[PDB]
Amino acid sequence: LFPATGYLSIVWKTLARALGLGVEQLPVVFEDVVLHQATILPKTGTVSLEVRLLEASRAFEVSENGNLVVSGKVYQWDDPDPRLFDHPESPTPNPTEPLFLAQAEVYKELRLRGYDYGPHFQGILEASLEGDSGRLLWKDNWVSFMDTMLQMSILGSAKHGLYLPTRVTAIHIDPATHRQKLYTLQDKAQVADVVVSRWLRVTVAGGVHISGLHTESAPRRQQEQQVPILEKFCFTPHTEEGCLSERAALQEELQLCKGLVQALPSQQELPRLLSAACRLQLNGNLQLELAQVLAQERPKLPEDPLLSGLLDSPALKACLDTAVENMPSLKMKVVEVLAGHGHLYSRIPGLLSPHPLLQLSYTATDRHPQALEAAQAELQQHDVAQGQWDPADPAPSALGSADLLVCNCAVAALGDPASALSNMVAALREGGFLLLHTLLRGHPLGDIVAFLTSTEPQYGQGILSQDAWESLFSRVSLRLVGLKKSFYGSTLFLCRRPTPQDSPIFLPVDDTSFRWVESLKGILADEDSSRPVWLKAINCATSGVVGLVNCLRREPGGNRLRCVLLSNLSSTSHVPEVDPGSAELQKVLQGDLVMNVYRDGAWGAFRHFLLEEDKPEEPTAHAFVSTLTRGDLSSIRWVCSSLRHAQPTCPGAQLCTVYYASLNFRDIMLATGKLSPDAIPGKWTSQDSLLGMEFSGRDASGKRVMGLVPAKGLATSVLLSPDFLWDVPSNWTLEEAASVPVVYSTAYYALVVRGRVRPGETLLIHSGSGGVGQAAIAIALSLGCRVFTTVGSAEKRAYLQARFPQLDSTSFANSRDTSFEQHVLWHTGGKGVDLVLNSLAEEKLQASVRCLATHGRFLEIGKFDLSQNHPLGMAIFLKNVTFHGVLLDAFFNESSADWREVWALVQAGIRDGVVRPLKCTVFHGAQVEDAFRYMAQGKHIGKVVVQVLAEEPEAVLKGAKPKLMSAISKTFCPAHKSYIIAGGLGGFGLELAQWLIQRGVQKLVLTSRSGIRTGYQAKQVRRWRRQGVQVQVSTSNISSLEGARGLIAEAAQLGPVGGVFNLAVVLRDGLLENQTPEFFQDVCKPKYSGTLNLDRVTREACPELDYFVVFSSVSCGRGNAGQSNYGFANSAMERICEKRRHEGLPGLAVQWGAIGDVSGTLPQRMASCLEVLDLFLNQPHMVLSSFVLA
Amino acid sequence: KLQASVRCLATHGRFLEIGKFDLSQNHPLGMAIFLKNVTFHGVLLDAF
Ligand SMILES: NC(=O)C1=CN([C@@H]2O[C@H](COP(=O)(O)OP(=O)(O)OC[C@H]3O[C@@H](n4cnc5c(N)ncnc54)[C@H](OP(=O)(O)O)[C@@H]3O)[C@@H](O)[C@H]2O)C=CC1
Ligand SMILES: NC(=O)C1=CN([C@@H]2O[C@H](COP(=O)(O)OP(=O)(O)OC[C@H]3O[C@@H](n4cnc5c(N)ncnc54)[C@H](OP(=O)(O)O)[C@@H]3O)[C@@H](O)[C@H]2O)C=CC1
């Protein structure tokens, strides 16, 4: 975006040229600068900005493509006053804080906010913590300097979000005093001192003086935001059976197929084929007639759920990951046989996308060129190649040796099992894999397919018994590493070509001293030897050997690494013996898999799976409507509410159940995104919903009440001060009462309190149909005034006429047009109207002002003109006119003593009968989006209310609890509980702490060996303490068990322990040869030992704990080079977390690819990281991962 | 100087104008001030 200071600079240069002076010779003054729009500089091309000056009026105007962009007033400064640039009195006389933000931290904070400034705009050398005074650079560029001024001004604002300048009351520039003020540091760099005075709304530095700067929140909505890949790190046995048993549709399909088979109906292709086969004849069915039939000639059998059920199940992903893992290289070569019918080419490439560094060379082969001729576009979109090899014959040299083979024999027909397997194993490289999908004979579905397809013997041959397949594998000297089996007899074979037998090394890796590193370091050094090196740990289930091998394999010589781990999550589970003579070790050796993990009577390895896309939901009593995507009504959905944790004792609390909640224009503007949430007065969390202003429901005591709330009133419960509650009259209905509060309260405040309306006066009430208009009309007629009202349409006119008989046909006008001015002036004899209640647009507003009579009073309740700061000719005040700015939002913040006046007025109106409920259209809670759309259309008359809960016949109900309801899950914390973040003063720790506080923690303990030693840390800590949070700094190591106990105890003082997070990390990078046992001890001490100490102490004395999060890294699992110790520590942490959950205790381990704001994966922005952390916290899996693919 | 006076106002403030120069000249007045609850009064004893 083009900086506003850029506009100022170009205007200044234009004025200097017009006067003939040079820029540095011309002290200029700006006034009433206004930025109507922001210009976006394109990457390629140029944008022309045109500046026109009106010398007579001292006005300028910048335009682009004939569109106004900037306007204001500019003129030469006749008599510069050096007194002007003297630094103002400091708002805080004595900060007395040696700490101060440096350049890096300043722009780190600004990046967190959303500002991304490059080197040329990084002009702030330092800034005081409060952000009031600092030092700026002077690179001889004016635009950079003034933009740095604006940056300094923005740095102090507590409000979050992205704010940009919109108006500047006045700017003074004096190059001479600027040159005088500049002074040099020790370096040759030139600097100037800046001072910001929020009290006087003035920013002064060098020879510049900005006053009255006004910044307006930007939407801050960027398209094409990063989309992280979410996965769950789950254990996976090598062999499984009944994989798809959970699915019902598959079972129903099986029932249908067997039913047709019985005695020799659905949309699925296979049941349709069976029905066709049985249709022609009940007995003696022709093989030809059943083989061919319309709606079956297509290769839609694979599309049948039964046949391709396993492929859709994760088993395919597990097998593919297993194949990829045991690759000496980082590149994979895969070939598909009979691809025309297999169609795996359309599926396999998609599954391997998550791997960041993997490079794939896929090639599809078929018996005949015409087969697979179709879908050539599908092949083209992927990196695949055509093929002609027919498996029966020996493989062509072109394919040669490939890492992996995929067959999909279940649908494709194989000429002969033995011959095809021989050809394949010939094609398969040494140590490669053969993925084979087939249907097992002797199973119900197997027998059913055997009865069918008898016409083609080749397919019949493909169907074989499980033991037959196993025997076939042995004959071709192929070893079955793993097997996946469906519940209906389908299966998925994964076989590996044996590698030349070699004597394997054995190295215990369970020593706590890490001295085994030297032993391993020596062995790997002997790169000449090709003997595989088998690391095996059996002493501890928490050994993180998995991460170690994952990292080591990348480093040179890592090809020889192979792991064997025994981790049982149940003590009762026995431990197999891994002695060389023991059978199990020999079996795993024959398999020759990199990862061999045994857990509770099963051999397997950890795998990555994409987790469910759906957002978790739970049944809750407290939930509030929210828009998950700002500006989209389609996203409106219910979310869990923080009200679950609340104190009923407090008299100010007065928690109330919600039955009907109304919608107002403000709610639509918020949902539509036309109104920024920050525009709502008050201190609001960044993540929250500000929908709904009024409601009506039963109090905690059951008494029916209607209430008014600043926001969050559209929910199943509201926390409200009793001052904002009225008792519903016995004759009203809770639905009716849902409309009275806001409209009547604002009408009374506008007329009686401010306008001081007297009986017999004259009024002009715009938008009579609207709720506020109806309330105002009802109030006025009671006094006995004469009313003029404007209505958009004829039906609204008729409705108002019916509702208010006293009102007359001459009391109407047209609102959408500006013709009412003539009508009012004519029917009033030209005198005008005493009182005006205006809520219309700029031109309508100007028209209304002319309607005022002498001693008139203008009541303004709109916002558009006020926000835009449109001018108002003051000549109207020559009469005794009084202009009122009426905002009801002020009461919710202060002046409650004043608010009681309006409360009494509304109560008196209610009891006297003046107050009448408006017409209501009811939408059920589940249809809230429909209500929003209907009100957005603008055809509604009266109010739109959402029936959150139906009213009971009883007048007063003892238990007013809301009915349980299902909504999206969110994370909130009780106020009384205490939370601990180990190493919370790091880059991630502080951001996580802030995120938690926004969830209402109120009691925090941050651990760090060094303690507060940076300006940013001190700034954040003091900011939090100002909000009332009880922050604490420990400096107690979690590595030492005594240290962990002390940390927990001191945390308990603030209150019961709620959650503990382990973000402590010390890293010592370097290749294995460089690593030494000391570095491993140092790296694992805060992460491995600390986690064990925290687990022990928490399980000992933290009964109320519910959150136990341990931050791991993607390097573990995925693998990375030169970070073996890091991977080991992370893997150990993950193992501890996995064990904890098995016992019912809470525990979580998160793997982050990279953090940007504070291995082929781009750094992830902090906002996305926190969102994903919330989602993870709400999920039940033991370990989760997140990263952004390059 | 009139513009300077407007800025000094606080929320719920009231502005009482008794000078008749700017009013007669019909000089502009930014309406953004009214966002803060504010009542701009045009005082003229002459009416009585
Ligand atoms: N103290 C304060 O600052 C407060 C201010 N207010 C203001 O009161 C005003 C009136 O609110 P209220 O009458 O309850 O609003 P409603 O939406 O209930 O009524 C809107 C009225 O104005 C017109 N209108 C407004 N918005 C739309 C729209 N999106 N689509 C179609 N027609 C629309 C309608 O047509 P038509 O007019 O043509 O018949 C209708 O008469 C608002 O401007 C609000 O900001 C309210 C309370 C507090
Ligand atoms: N890209 C990333 O940053 C990624 C982060 N992670 C993990 O996420 C977490 C957050 O990392 P992040 O905060 O960015 O990194 P930091 O390096 O900033 O975290 C280390 C912090 O912990 C403190 N600390 C060190 N030892 C201890 C100890 N024994 N007890 C208490 N505090 C201690 C350090 O202070 P001091 O040195 O003075 O003790 C420092 O403040 C870490 O667990 C990290 O491993 C993993 C994946 C990606």
Swiss-Prot record, chain B:
Modified residues (N6-acetyllysine): K20
Known tissue expression: Ubiquitous. Prominent expression in brain, lung, liver and mammary gland.
PTM remark: In adipocytes, S-nitrosylation of Fatty acid synthase occurs under physiological conditions and gradually increases during adipogenesis.
Subcellular location: Cytoplasm; Melanosome
Subunit structure, as described in the record: Homodimer which is arranged in a head to tail fashion. Interacts with CEACAM1; this interaction is insulin and phosphorylation-dependent; reduces fatty-acid synthase activity.
Note: The relatively low beta-ketoacyl synthase activity may be attributable to the low 4'-phosphopantetheine content of the protein.
Function, in words: Fatty acid synthetase is a multifunctional enzyme that catalyzes the de novo biosynthesis of long-chain saturated fatty acids starting from acetyl-CoA and malonyl-CoA in the presence of NADPH. This multifunctional protein contains 7 catalytic activities and a site for the binding of the prosthetic group 4'-phosphopantetheine of the acyl carrier protein ([ACP]) domain. (Microbial infection) Fatty acid synthetase activity is required for SARS coronavirus-2/SARS-CoV-2 replication.
Entry protein name: Fatty acid synthase
Gene name of the encoded protein: FASN
